[PDB]
Amino acid sequence: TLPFLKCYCSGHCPDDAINNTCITNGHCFAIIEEDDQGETTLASGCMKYEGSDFQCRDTPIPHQRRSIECCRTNLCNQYLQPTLPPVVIGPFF
């Protein structure tokens, strides 16, 4: 199905993106994450509809802390303000 959705992008822009927007048939997203140095960063873009359940949902405990949020109305990812998961204490998980 044809892309009907316009999103902001940042960090995950396609190489032909105009003004930091992209189009899609799935969802707009925003993600907050630590890099491998432990510095926090913010990105956004477009996510195709196939496989979006897996990506918008995510796993709760990847190597690096992150939180991705998704929406489906034009440019909606400008209102997404995701939050780093709380930190776990203890020498285990």
Partner: protein, 103 residues
């Protein structure tokens, strides 16, 4: 940086195919390269499998990230000499990278 297509010109003298291929002298092949991060954006054309494998990698790094590879290719014609030394025209599939994705 992230999966995308890059320029790559293959000159047939540089590979020494310069004496079995009569034309062209070379061509733009392009190539694919770059990261397949989480999440995989729309323009990376990923499969469900690769979306899933990306997520597993983030949890178990003994499992590779998806790989940036050509997801669309096109053909080119070449004129060339054969075993029986015949200067034949032949069309060659999958020669040029039209687009890249994470698979």
């Amino acid at each position: 940086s992230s999966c995308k297509r890059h320029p790559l010109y293959v000159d047939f003298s540089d590979v020494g195919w310069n004496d079995w291929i009569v034309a062209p002298p070379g061509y733009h092949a392009f190539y694919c390269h770059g990261e397949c991060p989480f999440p995989l954006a729309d323009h990376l054309n990923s499969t469900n499998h690769a979306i899933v494998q990306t997520l597993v990698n983030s949890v178990n790094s003994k499992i590779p990230k998806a790989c940036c590879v050509p997801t669309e290719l096109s053909a080119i014609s070449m004129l060339y000499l054969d075993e029986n030394e015949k200067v034949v025209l032949k069309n060659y599939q999958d020669m040029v990278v039209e687009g890249c994705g994470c698979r």
